[PDB]
Design a protein around this ligand. Sequence first.
Ligand SMILES: C[C@H]1O[C@H](O[C@H]2[C@H](O)[C@@H](O)[C@@H](O)O[C@@H]2CO)[C@H](O)[C@@H](O)[C@@H]1N[C@H]1C=C(CO)[C@@H](O)[C@H](O)[C@H]1O
Ligand SMILES: C[C@H]1O[C@H](O[C@H]2[C@H](O)[C@@H](O)CO[C@@H]2CO)[C@H](O)[C@@H](O)[C@@H]1N[C@H]1C=C(CO)[C@@H](O)[C@H](O)[C@H]1O
Length: 496
Amino acid sequence: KKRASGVLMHITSLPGDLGIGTFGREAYAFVDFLVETDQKFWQILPLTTTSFGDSPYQSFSAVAGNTHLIDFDLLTLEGFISKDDYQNISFGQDPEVVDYAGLFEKRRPVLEKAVKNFLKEERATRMLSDFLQEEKWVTDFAEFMAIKEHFGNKALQEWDDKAIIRREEEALAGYRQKLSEVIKYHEVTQYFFYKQWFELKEYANDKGIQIIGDMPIYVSADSVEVWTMPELFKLDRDKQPLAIAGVPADDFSDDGQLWGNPIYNWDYHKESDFDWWIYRIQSGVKMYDYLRIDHFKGFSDYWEIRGDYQTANDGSWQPAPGPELFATIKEKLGDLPIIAENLGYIDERAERLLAGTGFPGMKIMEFGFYDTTGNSIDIPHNYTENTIAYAGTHDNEVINGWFENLTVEQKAYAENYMRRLPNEPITETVLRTLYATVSQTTITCMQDLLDKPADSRMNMPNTVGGNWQWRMRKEDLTENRKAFLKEITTIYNRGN
Ligand SMILES: C[C@H]1O[C@H](O[C@H]2[C@H](O)[C@@H](O)[C@@H](O)O[C@@H]2CO)[C@H](O)[C@@H](O)[C@@H]1N[C@H]1C=C(CO)[C@@H](O)[C@H](O)[C@H]1O
Ligand SMILES: C[C@H]1O[C@H](O[C@H]2[C@H](O)[C@@H](O)CO[C@@H]2CO)[C@H](O)[C@@H](O)[C@@H]1N[C@H]1C=C(CO)[C@@H](O)[C@H](O)[C@H]1O
């Protein structure tokens, strides 16, 4: 099977003057750079909307576009805004750190000006409606966001009007009439998102560059889905989670993870023929070229923290109907370009899930040198072709960081195994080895390609301070870094 490689960089980490990466010029420059180095894949994070904490895996909707990624420049070149509208409206102090606090604050006059100008165009409504016909989910997400803003950006569970919380049709007809202009705002911003995003995906595809999108297993409890389709979750009459999502402690840290997402009533799914999941996967394979389903473990056995928790260890391992779901997807959708994220808590039910799909799974080389015997299943000599290998992912340390926190016997052993040449930064070491593996695809974390320090980690699971904030200086993508990436891509036979 044809070998290949790709780069792991979220749209947020692109550089720019808007305080956050955009579907704008530097995105097209990033594509240009991927074709320079004969890459195959661009892996991004999810493009969904974000909450407090700025995680895209706890989202107001499973399909809506994060509006922070809309580009003001592309919007100016359209006749919708001008640039005396965002020239010197500085979004953030440090270029290589996003400040999400108040960036939603600062984009809003600008986006509103653009939506007001888009609607006054004479063909406006027949373009917007022609859009809503292909993405039919838009309007009720837009009403969700409007009602949320009316109640002061308060969670769905703590709104004030219990009638609207459970969508009584008189209350609904009142809110959609009383708030029709702020709703149209959110419809139009979704139209902007999709127009710009599919422009970028088309540029990428026609240069031979393919996009690996991320699909979060769970949505947040503060969601248009918990609102319009509560029968998918274990919730009560006032729509609060009976049990929440998480993961228990494993052998390298004792407190585990509490996530907060609602839990699935997988029985309603099995009965409903997994309708909603077929729709998620279908819109995923249209949004992307390769879909990466997060937390594959959750389709065999998910961890279910009850209410009245004190830590996340107060839960259980519940059964999900993985086999049936994926047979249904195969039958109804054909076979599809999915890669499965199967890290952690692997038991033979999960290994059967994988074997039954034939999707590639993951190999995170950073987990595979903690045991100097060589027996770790994440050590390079145990990889097979049908896997996607990473140095780390966005939840692991950057390689420069991982290398600090090693037993000096573990350091010695790792420098042995990988044949580190003296006077050589170990990010280039690790990446040489990663690309030498028999894996069909290997992905390089744009942090480590530029040799960035421990500060640059994208996520650190089970915290909220300072996450999803890394951006990359254009100053740091020296011709030397690019030449290094092209070299490892040619030497180990993974080009184009
Ligand atoms: C990523 C993973 O690391 C730790 O778990 C185990 C490794 O994944 C295993 O392969 C093996 O080496 O044992 C490790 C335990 O020491 C950690 O305990 C897990 O919690 C962690 N996985 C969680 C994090 C995710 C972020 O993507 C989820 O994808 C994953 O489903 C969670 O379980
Ligand atoms: C929303 C959580 O996202 C992350 O967990 C991800 C994981 O990183 C992915 O690879 C797979 O999906 C899970 C979620 O589906 C974070 O690791 C996790 O910390 C995030 N939750 C944070 C946000 C809140 C807000 O209430 C807290 O409740 C939660 O405990 C906190 O960790």
